[PDB]
């Protein structure tokens, strides 16, 4: 079926231009029965439609009235993609940005619905430079016969900006994982923990690795967590 | 120009209950252009209802849309824990092209669950760098209210910890919480007893987990 692959920088300096691209597989950027949209989301402003482009024997674009001067959406038929360019950004433009397919089911009687949404790209509008995290183990301690459950984890400390992603055993360990929201420290760097509960009996036999990926800094860390 | 106002802002209901989520438009919305979306934690929004009443493909029959004009509603019959989500309405018009409501957060009520508590000393790797992070974990509790107190050699700590909490689990509807006490290495090595004390509705009396530095 259809995949919407998003790309572009997670960090943009104030007053500079925020650019993102959506590469489509399984549908056509120039199909005359859909439209291609950008929508963003922030905790303050909620969901905000930004604009769309679509082809009906020629290309059209429509932008949100509040952004009509600052934005441009450009389709690329040779790569089957479309991109967003938002000029003169401020911290009000810090958001998760989604590329989104619009469709009218049962046209011409129907109306618009947003039926496919990409995974979304967090963009932070901020001046500091990127910094990769230090990754420290949270070791299970004296929990080898303490009820059969051991908690272990990774402390992911002193990175900028968000986000980091954490997996366990390269995605093979998912049940019992809790990865917490990051907190911003007084240094202006983020810190996050990811924990998992495992059978105490397995600590001697099973290897547990947290895989930490910080895309803005091209940092990847695999940290083995072992008992004390 | 067309403003969608959702109510209530937050709703907490038990599995098996029914939920009515309301969406009120500042002026009339053509019925073909009113849609509803569901957004679960960490995920993008998903289309639920379009053209006011029409379920998207493979959406369960428990979800139904209704209304006309200014007043619209999403009804969820026989709530399940996996329905924990924020629900948004959305419209389109020629003057204000697309707008969304601000969302209704549907929370799931369950029976009280006490947290399981764990404490983690700072790693030797981190101490090498001059700072010590002590972590306290509160796993799988309900409701969300919980108090974590850090004590160092029985001295209550203030101002030197941060915490964060997960959203309700989609399967068992519990929360988990992590609290980090951050000390300089010098301060960490100056004390012996490190303790996390936890108060919660599900505990008849507070639970303390502790360790002694170098043990």
Author numbering:
A (entry chain H): 1 to 31, 31A, 31B, 32 to 52, 52A, 52B, 53 to 82, 82A, ...
B (entry chain L): 1 to 30, 30A, 31 to 95, 95A, 96 to 213
Copy text from the publication.
We describe two genetically similar VH6-1 bnAb clonotypes from the same individual that exhibit different developmental paths toward broad neutralization activity. HA is a trimeric glycoprotein that is critical for viral entry and is composed of a globular head domain atop a more elongated stem domain. The HA head domain contains the receptor-binding site that engages sialoside receptors on host cells and is highly diverse among subtypes, whereas the stem domain carries the machinery for virus-host membrane fusion and is relatively conserved. Two HA stem-directed bnAb clonotypes, A and B, were elicited upon vaccination with H5N1 and H7N9 from a single donor (Andrews et al., 2017).
Others, such as VH6-1-encoded bNAbs, preferentially bind group 1 subtypes and then increase in breadth to group 2 subtypes, similar to the VH6-1 clonotype B described here (Joyce et al., 2016; Kallewaard et al., 2016). Members of clonotype A preferentially bound group 2 HA, whereas members of clonotype B primarily recognized group 1 HA. As expected given their HA group preferences, clonotype B was more prevalent after group 1 H5N1 vaccination, and clonotype A dominated after group 2 H7N9 immunization.
